[PDB]
């Protein structure tokens, strides 16, 4: 879902087409390029990012979410003249929850001792989201 489905949904969405309604008034087009995804991060009261460990999100009633970014591209096509591309960049569009011990967790490639240092059971299977501190499993 996070590697081949979100980008499929985003790149298979029609380019948002806009033309000024109020001599061929300006026309604006937007297309969504690659999706970028990050590590599950937190933002304290002072706005500083700090990696959100799973145990902390269980203690502090947090969601184990990862900020989602997508490259958008504008196109100012106007008055039968040259266009202005202006590819914005990675742009924040949300926070997709992260399944514990998936490839995109902060626990994906850590050994037993590292898991213990982060205060996690090396036998815990994974496969449950942390939504508001409570672990949730998606029954098939």
């Amino acid at each position: 879902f996070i590697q081949m489905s979100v980008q499929r949904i985003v790149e298979d969405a029609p380019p948002i087409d806009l033309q000024a309604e109020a001599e061929e008034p300006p026309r604006y087009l937007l297309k969504f390029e690659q999706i970028y995804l990050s590590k599950p991060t937190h933002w304290e009261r002072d706005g500083a990012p700090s990696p959100m460990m799973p145990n902390e999100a269980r203690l502090r009633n947090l969601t184990y979410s990862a900020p989602l970014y997508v490259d958008i591209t504008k196109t100012v096509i106007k008055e039968g003249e040259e266009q202005l591309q202006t590819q914005h960049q990675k742009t924040f569009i949300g926070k997709i929850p992260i399944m514990l011990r998936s490839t995109y967790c902060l626990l994906n490639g850590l050994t037993d001792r590292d898991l213990c240092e982060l205060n996690e059971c090396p036998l815990d299977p994974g496969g449950y989201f942390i939504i508001n501190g409570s672990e949730k499993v998606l029954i098939a």
Binding site: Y69, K90, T91, F92
Partner: protein, 88 residues
């Protein structure tokens, strides 16, 4: 991501364009108005206020003060509801 501007650039160009004129415009030609509506009422028998405004270059309240004297608004019209004309 969302990064620190003195002012957003779109609003900046809106301002820099409002550095051209003022929507509270002047006016001297009261006879002018009928010249265009002679030729153009075949396109719209009743023209909107937003129609007259850009064809003219006058503020809205003064243009409306004249449009009271010259014509009447077609409150119930087949196309829409806007300002018709007394022929004379």
């Amino acid at each position: 991501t969302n990064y620190k501007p003195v002012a957003n650039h779109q609003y900046n160009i809106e301002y820099e364009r409002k550095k051209k004129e003022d929507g509270k415009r002047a006016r001297a030609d009261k006879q002018h108005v009928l010249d265009m509506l002679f030729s153009a009422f075949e396109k719209h028998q009743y023209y909107n206020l937003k129609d007259l405004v850009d064809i003219t270059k006058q503020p809205v309240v003064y243009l409306k003060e004249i449009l009271k004297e010259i014509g009447v608004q077609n409150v119930k019209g087949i196309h829409k509801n806007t300002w018709e004309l007394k022929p004379e």
